[PDB]
Amino acid sequence: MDCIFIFRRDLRLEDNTGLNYALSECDRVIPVFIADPRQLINNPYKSEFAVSFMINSLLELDDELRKKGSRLNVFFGEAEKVVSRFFNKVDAIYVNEDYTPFSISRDEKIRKVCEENGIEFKAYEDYLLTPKSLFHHRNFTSFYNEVSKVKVREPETMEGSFDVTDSSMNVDFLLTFKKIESPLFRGGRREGLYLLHRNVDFRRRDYPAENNNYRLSPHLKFGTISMREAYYTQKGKEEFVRELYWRDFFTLLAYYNPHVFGHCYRREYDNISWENNESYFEAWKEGRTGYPIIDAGMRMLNSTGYINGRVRMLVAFFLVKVLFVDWRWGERYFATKLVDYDPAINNGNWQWIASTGVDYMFRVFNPWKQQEKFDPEAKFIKEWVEELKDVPPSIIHSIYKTKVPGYPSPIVNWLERVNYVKSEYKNV
Numbered sequence: 001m002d003c004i005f006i007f008r009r010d011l012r013l014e015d016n017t018g019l020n021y022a023l024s025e026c027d028r029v030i031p032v033f034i035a036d037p038r039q040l041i042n043n044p045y046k047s048e049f050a051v052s053f054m055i056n057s058l059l060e061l062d063d064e065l066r067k068k069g070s071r072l073n074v075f076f077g078e079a080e081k082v083v084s085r086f087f088n089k090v091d092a093i094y095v096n097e098d099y100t101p102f103s104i105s106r107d108e109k110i111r112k113v114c115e116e117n118g119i120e121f122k123a124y125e126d127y128l129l130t131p132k133s134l135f136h137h138r139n140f141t142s143f144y145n146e147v148s149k150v151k152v153r154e155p156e157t158m159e160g161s162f163d164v165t166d167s168s169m170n171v172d173f174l175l176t177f178k179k180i181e182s183p184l185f186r187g188g189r190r191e192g193l194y195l196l197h198r199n200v201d202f203r204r205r206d207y208p209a210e211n212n213n214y215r216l217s218p219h220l221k222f223g224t225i226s227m228r229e230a231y232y233t234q235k236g237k238e239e240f241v242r243e244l245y246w247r248d249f250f251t252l253l254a255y256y257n258p259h260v261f262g263h264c265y266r267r268e269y270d271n272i273s274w275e276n277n278e279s280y281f282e283a284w285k286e287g288r289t290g291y292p293i294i295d296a297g298m299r300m301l302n303s304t305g306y307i308n309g310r311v312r313m314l315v316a317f318f319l320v321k322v323l324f325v326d327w328r329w330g331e332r333y334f335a336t337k338l339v340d341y342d343p344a345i346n347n348g349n350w351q352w353i354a355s356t357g358v359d360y361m362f363r364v365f366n367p368w369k370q371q372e373k374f375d376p377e378a379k380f381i382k383e384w385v386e387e388l389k390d391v392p393p394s395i396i397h398s399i400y401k402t403k404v405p406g407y408p409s410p411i412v413n414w415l416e417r418v419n420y421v422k423s424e425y426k427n428v
């Protein structure tokens with residue numbers, strides 16, 4: 001048959017489930033990418049960094065296609081409407097299903113349009129490491145132990161034929177949306193594999209100053225490499241593989257509990273009276289809070305669109321349990337900066353930290369203790385907080401006692417706040 005494959009979040013030609021079936025089931029396959037205005041224009045949850053990474057990855061994907069006497073066929077508009085106008089005469093349409101409300105309804109509409117035109121619509125599982133039917137767990141540890149026993153499908157690629165549509169635009173069109181690139185990523189599968197092979201001490205992955213994180217999230221989220229590939233390449237590293245499974249967990253959690261997008265996983269907490277002091281929130285986004293480690297984190301994130309998991313949760317903790325600001329505010333702000341923004345993964349993590357999610361205990365961290373343990377030399381802090389650039393570490397770790405020039409002193413006492421926020425939770 002003459003069919004179409006629509007890329008979305010699986011920006012690669014290797015080990016792409018839906019693409020594989022498409023290549024083996026039809027004679028010619030037209031590789032398509034649809035620039036959707038609901039995602040690229042006036043998206044409150046849009047990240048400029050994430051977009052650049054996607055565009056760059058889309059540019060790289062286009063090269064791989066040209067090396068096969070084809071090219072990426074680009075269209076513009078809402079997915080369902082695009083299919084409707086341009087593909088009404090194609091045989092079938094292949095894709096990889098996703099798990100968010102937006103994605104689910106978008107595919108339902110494409111399905112309707114497909115039935116009323118005689119186009120076969122085939123969606124396949126690809127983003128997850130495990131089959132979705134296998135989910136039915138309260139917490140992560142329960143999930144991992146049960147599902148990790150299952151065998152991960154091995155990467156594979158089918159041979160086929162890539163065709164083109166003269167009408168369609170080409171990747172050049174997408175350059176309008178690439179406005180500001182992360183100095184820390186370049187996108188594409190080639191960079192992805194390079195990162196996948198750096199040998200780091202994952203053991204010390206908590207220390208920001210060190211370089212022990214693979215920085216693979218954006219590549220996994222946008223699919224320059226498959227979940228299965230990351231898995232087999234690192235199969236021997238238990239720590240990394242278990243963390244890889246956290247992606248599946250949060251995705252599936254959201255898939256089976258759509259209400260997380262807008263409400264608390266544990267609904268009762270939808271009654272918390274967030275102080276939401278717009279003033280503190282503004283200080284948090286600018287990294288002008290009085291805590292060095294928190295300031296360093298936000299500042300890095302702002303200019304880079306990335307921060308390791310340790311800083312990520314310290315920052316999230318501080319906004320929710322110390323400045324007492326609704327986690328949804330932080331969720332949205334992050335969605336705005338993360339080069340690796342993933343709706344379900346971002347949501348899952350925020351709720352976890354705000355303890356309105358999968359973690360049922362009311363977890364608390366000591367900013368100063370934390371700061372001093374994971375950045376003993378204050379190297380990370382000095383790298384991102386301009387003003388403390390020359391203050392000796394010893395002082396920085398106690399900067400609440402002093403008051404260096406140009407650096408605001410703590411905007412609140414975390415201890416008193418955390419106690420109040422908790423009482424407010426128990427109150428509920």
Ligand SMILES: Cc1cc2nc3c(=O)[nH]c(=O)nc-3n(C[C@H](O)[C@H](O)[C@H](O)COP(=O)(O)OP(=O)(O)OC[C@H]3O[C@@H](n4cnc5c(N)ncnc54)[C@H](O)[C@@H]3O)c2cc1C
Pocket residue numbers: 007008009033034035036037038039040043044045046047050051054098100102103261262331335341343347
């Ligand atoms: C900034 C960005 C732009 C992208 N543009 C395209 C594109 O043009 N074409 C394409 O095929 N794929 C695009 N992608 C890839 C996208 O991840 C896949 O298309 C995916 O299948 C779509 O579902 P999503 O939930 O990730 O949509 P996303 O782009 O995250 O979001 C789509 C819609 O959901 C809203 N939304 C996102 N997060 C939240 C939240 N936490 N709470 C409430 N609402 C939220 C957005 O505002 C928008 O209205 C883009 C991804 C990002 C992060």
Ligand SMILES: Cc1cc2nc3c(=O)[nH]c(=O)nc-3n(C[C@H](O)[C@H](O)[C@H](O)COP(=O)(O)OP(=O)(O)OC[C@H]3O[C@@H](n4cnc5c(N)ncnc54)[C@H](O)[C@@H]3O)c2cc1C
Pocket residue numbers: 205212213214215216217218220221240243244245246247250307308309310312313316334338340341342343345346347349350353
């Ligand atoms: C408040 C908060 C928001 C977050 N938002 C996102 C997000 O929007 N998109 C996203 O991809 N990750 C998010 N995470 C998870 C995690 O921080 C990032 O995946 C990680 O920092 C990416 O950098 P890395 O690849 O170097 O991770 P490293 O530790 O090198 O690699 C570990 C890998 O395991 C997985 N992983 C590790 N921690 C988590 C986690 N907590 N949740 C899910 N998967 C994990 C990822 O594949 C990650 O690449 C968030 C975490 C927190 C606490």
